[PDB]
Amino acid sequence: MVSTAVEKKKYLDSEFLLHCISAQLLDMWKQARARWLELVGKEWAHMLALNPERKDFLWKNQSEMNSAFFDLCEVGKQVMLGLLGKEVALPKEEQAFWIMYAVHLSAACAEELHMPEVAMSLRKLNVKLKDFNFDMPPEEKKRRMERKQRIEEARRHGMP
């Protein structure tokens, strides 16, 4: 499953997504991907400055990067639903998608941020994904619910 998803990592490239999801959702995906990678790259550059030999990325649980990753997962899930043309995926479809998502983002860290391949591992991403798929204030809960609604609406070409 992870073997086939390695080639299928290109499936989340903008050029492969184009015309298969709405223009609005595609732009949300492009922006959310860029935002997360930029934050990862900043955090890494600081870490590397302090230990040039390090090979691990420490994921800070209370960080802008972490919040940006959550939002990227939210957009990613709607990308999946957009590709399938469904509101609720089969669990096998979800498992396939999240594998492709994790392979895609891990490749981007090695290829686009030039991080050691072992730093942003498939396993690390999966730990955080499990959190997404399974002490936040009430106002921030509201915020995330309104954002998810806006992404869902983008996916449906502006429809509820």
Here the CATH number for the domain that contains residue 151 is: 1.20.120.1440
Is 66:60 a contact under the CB 8 Å cutoff?
A: yes
Hey, how many other C-beta atoms are within 10 angstroms of the C-beta on 121?
Answer: 16
Q: Which of 118, 32, 15 is nearest to 68 (CA)?
A: 32
For residues 139 and 13, what is the distance between their CA atoms, to the nearest angstrom? 34
For residues 24 and 70, what is the distance between their CA atoms, to the nearest angstrom? 19
Rg (CA), the chain: 16
Resolution (A): 1.9
Supply the range of the domain harboring residue 152: 2-160
Total domain count, the chain: 1
Q: On the CB side of 147, how many CA atoms lie within 13 Å of its CA?
A: 17
For residues 148 and 77, what is the distance between their CA atoms, to the nearest angstrom? 10
For the chain, the three-class secondary structure string (H helix, E strand, C coil) is CHHHHHHHHHHHCHHHHCCCCCHHHHHHHHHHHHHHHHHHHHHHHHHHHHCCCCCCCCCCCCCHHHHHHHHHHHHHHHHHHHHHCCCCCCHHHHHHHHHHHHHHHHHHHHHCCCCCCCCCCHHHHHHHHHHHHCCCCHHHHHHHHHHHHHHHHHHCCCCC
From residue 124, alpha-carbon distances to 127, 129, 130, 131, 144 in Å are 5, 9, 10, 11, 23
